[model samples]
Target: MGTVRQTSGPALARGDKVAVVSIANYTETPDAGHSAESIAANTLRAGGIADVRIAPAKALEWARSQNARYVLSGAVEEWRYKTGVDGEPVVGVTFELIDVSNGAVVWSATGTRTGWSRSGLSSVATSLIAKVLSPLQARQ
Candidate 1:
């Protein structure tokens, strides 16, 4: 299940500079955070935003230095295989789009997805992150 909300502000346009900060990890796995960050940044690029920069640390400060219009910040709430016979993969995340100039969140969302037993963790996380950021995709 997932939910997305947006506030009226500057709309994301093609070629708009965006900084994707490192996604925080709340799960036990340390790699999940890095994985999510990479997946999210790639997803944004695929969505038609060309000038996408990644900030591994100091999200807002780095974004300001880059002169990015907006910053993508989020956290991996859950990323692990469920304990069971099938051991299905499950992922949950929360994200926010903030205006760099004023530090106001223009969009926010929370999403969770579960995959079949054979599904890989990265694939599931990729799908969920894509779904959550779908609304922000630049229009052709």
Candidate 2:
């Protein structure tokens, strides 16, 4: 006689529509070199969410209006941890998949990954994005 936790909140149909918003950079000034929005969209596509669209400003609301089943949004933070020796870089990605109907977060993920250098940070980011959206592969 106990309540049960919801193991799964929702499911995504194959080719489900998704909205990818530009992930803001809270750790540093926005760098065109590190475009999280495009990266995140690519990640979604690779994950089988092909009908991905970019929201202009208000991603969640715009996506809801656009009939997207879910919206993917998050922020990125990158920093150097060491004093010298090229300074080991660290990147943190926090992403959420919100239900467009009720604006509820059906899925979320946050993790930090260390990188060897600037270019190496890109690799970590790619893998991190994939991991963030991995849980939503139920229908895809």
Candidate 3:
């Protein structure tokens, strides 16, 4: 086995097609107007990108069929202890950027948030996505 960095497509930028997969194992109230999928889309859109699509499934096959250059897929796990009168939700997240062409993970990150309530999902996702794609800046 050899240690190396394999290339899979170029860096992403505005107008690139990106598919955001729905977040699993998380619940969002109706008032949030924002779910994990929407949060990922919005975050990519704000980064000067377009054609941000949302896929509810983790099947990268669908993303390839849709001609998406990249796919962002992740899950958020929330847990609470029943022994306490007061429960603080803990959220653990793992997100990855996959190259749709060859199914290579170009980037990935993991994070945890304590006391994550219904209203904080958007903020948490936005922060995470922003940091995850920070290295893929616009070309000069």
Model 1, stretches more than 4 Å misplaced? 1-10
RMSD of each: 2.1, 6.3, 7.0
Local accuracy by lDDT, each model = 0.83, 0.66, 0.60
User: lDDT of model 3 at residue 1?
Assistant: 10
Estimate TM-scores for all models.
0.89, 0.77, 0.64
lDDT for model 3, please.
0.60
Rank ordering of all candidates by lDDT, starting from the highest: 1, 2, 3
Q: Which lDDT value does model 3 have at 134? A: 53
Best by lDDT: 1
On residues 12-83, what C-alpha lDDT tens digit does candidate 2 reach at each position?
776679887666778753552246677778777776776888777545657867789888777775533445
Residue 85 local lDDT, model 2: 62
Candidate with top TM-score is 1
lDDT of 3 by residue, 5-66 (tens): 22333567776688886556553433222355676677677767777888753377798888
Worst 10 residues of 2 by lDDT: 1-10
Which stretches in model 2 have alpha-carbon errors above 4 Å?
Answer: 1-9, 32-34, 57-59, 79-83, 117-119, 138-140
lDDT of candidate 1 over 1-140, digit per residue (tens): 34444443445799789998877899998788888888988999998888887886445777889989999988998999889778988899989898888888888888888888898888889998998888778976
